[PDB]
Design a protein around this nucleic acid. Sequence first.
RNA 1: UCUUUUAUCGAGAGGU
Lengths: 93, 168, 521, 88, 48, 84, 250, 58, 171
Amino acid sequence: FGEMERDCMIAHGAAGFLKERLMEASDAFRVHVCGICGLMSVIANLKKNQFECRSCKNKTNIYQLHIPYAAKLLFQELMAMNIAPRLYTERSG
Amino acid sequence: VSTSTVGARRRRAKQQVDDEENATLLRLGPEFALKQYDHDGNEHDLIALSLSESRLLIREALKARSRARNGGVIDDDELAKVTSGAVANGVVKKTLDYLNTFARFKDEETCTAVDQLLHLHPFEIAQLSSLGCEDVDEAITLIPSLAAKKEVNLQRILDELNRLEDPY
Amino acid sequence: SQFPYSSAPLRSVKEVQFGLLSPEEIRAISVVKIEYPEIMDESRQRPREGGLNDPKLGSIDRNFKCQTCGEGMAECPGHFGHMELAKPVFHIGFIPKIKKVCECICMNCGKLLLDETNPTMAQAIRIRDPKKRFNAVWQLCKTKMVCEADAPKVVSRGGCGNTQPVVRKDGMKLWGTWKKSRDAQPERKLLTPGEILNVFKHISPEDCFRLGFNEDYARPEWMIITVLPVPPPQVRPSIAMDETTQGQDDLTHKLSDILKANINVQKLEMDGSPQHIINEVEQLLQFHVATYMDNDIAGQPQALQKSGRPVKAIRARLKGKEGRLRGNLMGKRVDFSARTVISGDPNLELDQVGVPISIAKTLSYPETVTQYNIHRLTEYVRNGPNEHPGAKYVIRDNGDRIDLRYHKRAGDIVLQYGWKVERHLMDDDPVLFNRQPSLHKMSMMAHRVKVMPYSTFRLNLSVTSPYNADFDGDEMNLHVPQSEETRAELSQLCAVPLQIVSPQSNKPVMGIVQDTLCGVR
Amino acid sequence: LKHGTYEKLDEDGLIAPGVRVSGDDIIIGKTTPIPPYHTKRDASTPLRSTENGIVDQVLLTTNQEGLKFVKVRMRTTKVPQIGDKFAS
Amino acid sequence: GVIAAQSIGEPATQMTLNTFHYAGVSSKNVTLGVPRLKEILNVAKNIK
Amino acid sequence: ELAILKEERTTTPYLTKYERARILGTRALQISMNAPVLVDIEGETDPLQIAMKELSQRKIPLVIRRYLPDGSYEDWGCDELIVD
Amino acid sequence: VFSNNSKFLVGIVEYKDLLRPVSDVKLTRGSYVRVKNGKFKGDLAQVDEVLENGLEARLKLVPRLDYGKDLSYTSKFRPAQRLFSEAEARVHEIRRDRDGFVTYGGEEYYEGFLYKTFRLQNLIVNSINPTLNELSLFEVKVGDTVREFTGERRQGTILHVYRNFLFLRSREIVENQGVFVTSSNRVGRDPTLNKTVKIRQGGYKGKIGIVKEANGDRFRVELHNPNKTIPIPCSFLLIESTHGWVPYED
Amino acid sequence: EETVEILFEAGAAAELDDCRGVSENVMLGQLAPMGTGAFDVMIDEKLLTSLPADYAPT
Amino acid sequence: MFFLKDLSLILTLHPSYFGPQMNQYLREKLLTDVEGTCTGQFGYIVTVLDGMNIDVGKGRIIPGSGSAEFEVKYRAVVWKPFKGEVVDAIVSNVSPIGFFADVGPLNVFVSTRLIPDNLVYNPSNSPPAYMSNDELITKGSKVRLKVVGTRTDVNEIYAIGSIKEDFLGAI
RNA sequence: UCUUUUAUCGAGAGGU
Ligand SMILES: [Mg+2]
Ligand SMILES: [Zn+2]
Ligand SMILES: [Zn+2]
Ligand SMILES: [Zn+2]
């Protein structure tokens, strides 16, 4: 699904079809992130229902996200080169 | 899960160390501070509740809830039944008996009297309305926050809170 | 709905924040230490508590639940490690910036040379965006030849009154030259990373602002490497070769070599030290840390593999047409696709297509069981996955999947409200239809399906003008929708009749071609 | 083990000519011994997943070193239809 | 924007890549077709 | 806070094609998972056909919230946008 | 020699250090070493004794044996480690030499351990790291690990369980203390598949096939004649058996 | 074009990126604000006061 | 400490329950959830002020799911402990390791080491109590204590106090 | 009642 077909489905305007073609019908993934530090380094456990972000001692302010796996791999390598991307869920001007 | 009104307080370059709770030094954490905000963002003060206004206002809201659920048609435990679930049944039950057997006042009229008396920090404002004291040393030993204020007039506050205090 | 249930409120990304990493941060987020170069335990399977496979890391086996988090191999995102160092080293991607900063400031007491008493400086303090700010600053502080121990009655800014050397670059090393005082002899020593660390660890915060950085995200002494992260083996997979042989992805061998060089750098400066044996091995460690993030370092030969091929440094997984940002995010690979050869047919209507029987019985469509269609889905579930018209998988609500192939006795199925049915592709579904390479926005159009035998697609010939297509052996592609929203968007936006007039030139595109034209004349 | 039927092999592991083979029919069963019951691992060689042919000729001889060495030759017939290409 | 970039990017892929014409005259030089468009979208500070 | 009242609304009163598309899609997605349908259901069973049949007679209960460029917005009812 | 004009000058003050002749020289009886060669490569061993000359050391090793099971070794194909069992050797395949000492296949085993000589250069004496495995080798709530919530004894093991308190035991302080219970924080599928078939009804009558899949009532026969597998009812098939083509009574 | 050096220039400069273009919101898998996506669909209530009272949310 | 906290809860409503009585079911689930729970950020939320007039507003139909998002804005009479807070209590249980004292919504444990040496646990007395001269602490006695410890189990909090000081004892 | 495996790097020959 080349970049040019992406440009065409932008030319038509079907944003939902694109959000589909680049998610469900390929590689969806889920990541639990913190809200103070802003990194994908949350230690989570589900059938016990408990979370922990040891970099800030935070067991309350955590949010889950739906991203492709390739973005997870990308950001893990960028962190592996000491360049940190931080993701926040609310604007602040 | 259930939030409130306060956000922001964002992390900076430092970590503040005056963050622990101490009710003897007026440290109530970042939740019951001095200046709060309502459901719209307007600047509000803190509303601390002492015993008398506590019981009276609980009776008010829960009686308007009883008559309200009755379409428009009095006791502690029966009024705690208007709620839902069992947590408010037990907890609100022992809360109504608790705040019931210590009522320094049982009327909204003398509640208006002391409401004229009190109005000063809202916590210690509701604490002057809270603990019934004898002399001044009790008022400063129970509340060590009235030290560095230099504004007494507390003896007649005790003579009015005690002179008006209805008998139990 | 693929995912197990959690309890964290669902949101979305709004603002992305970039910034350098600090060492103590890496010491905090990491959950294990790296020490031992050998990969295996001691030939007894598993790993070596301390090696580059410690099961605290990434667990990619059928049964080993990730000991750190506890999940399987489908929920663990991996966990970072951290390797120590016995010496700080440069970062190959920042050298010219460290050069400029080692020019702008003092070389002792650590203070910004020019001050706001200079009108050019006094107006250079003000700019908003940092890059043009530091352009305006470095435009000036490249010529201040003394850390004035005074201000321009004597006022002392706090400077040390020392002269200033000149810094230059060769390969991966910075040279410092002191032209002493008309001209007395220069001395060109080597600014080792430890010195520059000690110097940058003194800059006041307001100069960390004036230099264009930020006190809580870009701190200059963070640019010089001290501790090192170790990515989880979800990033470094190990292939299985002839089933009984397995090599290691490059980053494993490279991290192992860096650790070898670390254990080498320890010993020499702990006892017998012939001086010219210390700086050489340390320079080798700098070389490893350099070729861990860049292979085409202009200036020095590429670090080869064991078999003599250049190593895939991290810098190359990303850039390029076949890396990450061109190859797995802008244009990834999709499902529910179809590729086959075209063929002409003059007995269709303008927006139809002819799907073979096999492509129809392979592709599918999820449908919701309601009250208006339960009968048709009873017939479809009865007709099985090997006869048209029939259905395939049946999906219940929690996440299970009944497969009507292996499920011998399927006559006992009763359909509850809310389930889904992956039926076949049938008549009148709107499918997207595409040819490479697409140029103007008319090369992707949604047609209506029509099932036909044989092995080729079908087109009405009047749609051979936007596709630039002809039946002399070409191929095209069919994409299938899934949910209802996207079907609505296809039928209401990407149809054929709504594309007859082109916005390129205010004139149509589809007309009469070939025999129909000659014989209508 | 792999999935396709193993019932078309004779006893030494080589399918005989004259047998019809279709989708993923195993034609050469070969085993690799496990490095030290249930002590061997399969290393077969299946027919391609998109072919339907009659086995034609099987060859069995030795290699260079001194071990066995097998080849198989399948064949099939093809007929023109809607889609095949032609040229003058 | 995309519709404009395409509606200009499409008549380009079918235009002379050397054009010639006035080719039999050395006193008259002119750049047309591709090379000219490339010398336009680049703002080349030296034309032909 | 940033909303515009029901007298100062200055955006065009015509249902554009993108809006129509998302209305039909979402309403169909609701009609599918057993939701009350607000017309006389007769000889069509496809949810998209039912949604268009509703949009023809104007019974769809939804609210368009057009975000203006700088941060404000406007709220239009789907039963006063003049369907072309 | 590298042709580049790379020679460098040494300072006079650096000369003697260039000629320093030399204290690892370690290895003591009773200590552990790691073997560097053979099937025991990587294994921990105790130094039992050294040769008079001073070259090879006798090591006490957990054996890796098969008791001659497949006789008529390499490191890659070595056996698991397990103490020598002389009765197993007696049963399966042995010379008694002393109390608890047997020579088995020309190696000596004393109280279950191999004693074998190795060159000192074939053992590692420095920086050995014992493994997890080597460390292993060389009233309901009562017993569970609880971690104080508002006390001062971290964790501890619940020794007693009352109604208002719980006698917990510390790990570092090793002292039994009572704490509130709530205060403590608990921390084939058918017989005709693949069998040859003849079809007796339908458009495929007289054609050979094989039952590829017979889930139920509707079978899938792989026709021999064209490369296609068809759906056919099981009533339409004859199966081959001991005597001729039998119907579905086989 | 020129990726890693731009990511360094932004990494050591604390450039806050803010999510408004199409490329960003697509390469994270979200609804890109374009055509279909420039508004929202709030569930109604005034016209819910038109349903028969029986369909109610119990 | 008791307060009047302004809380807003996000109720994500399902499309099927879009009946003619939305706001009613909204208040139903709201007051099924919030009323009584413990939050380490705001303790035990007791009772909401004014429950039948809460402006729930309108809901953003979450793009891609079909559900609704409601931002309920209410006001309650919450409680929250703090370290060093002097509060009253009514005990509920006595034990050789300390006594339990209900401070309204919760129960506070007081260990023996935080009890003056004069108060001696008397199992023989019926009912059992902590006894001394001119002093008596039995089940149901008014106790004046000081909150010196708070633990957050996310679900519920657990406080500890003492009465080995001045003006803390039996009143 | 499911499920069910296709290395890797590189080179070349091709089709629109
Ligand atoms: Mg062609
Ligand atoms: Zn954090
Ligand atoms: Zn993990
Ligand atoms: Zn200086």
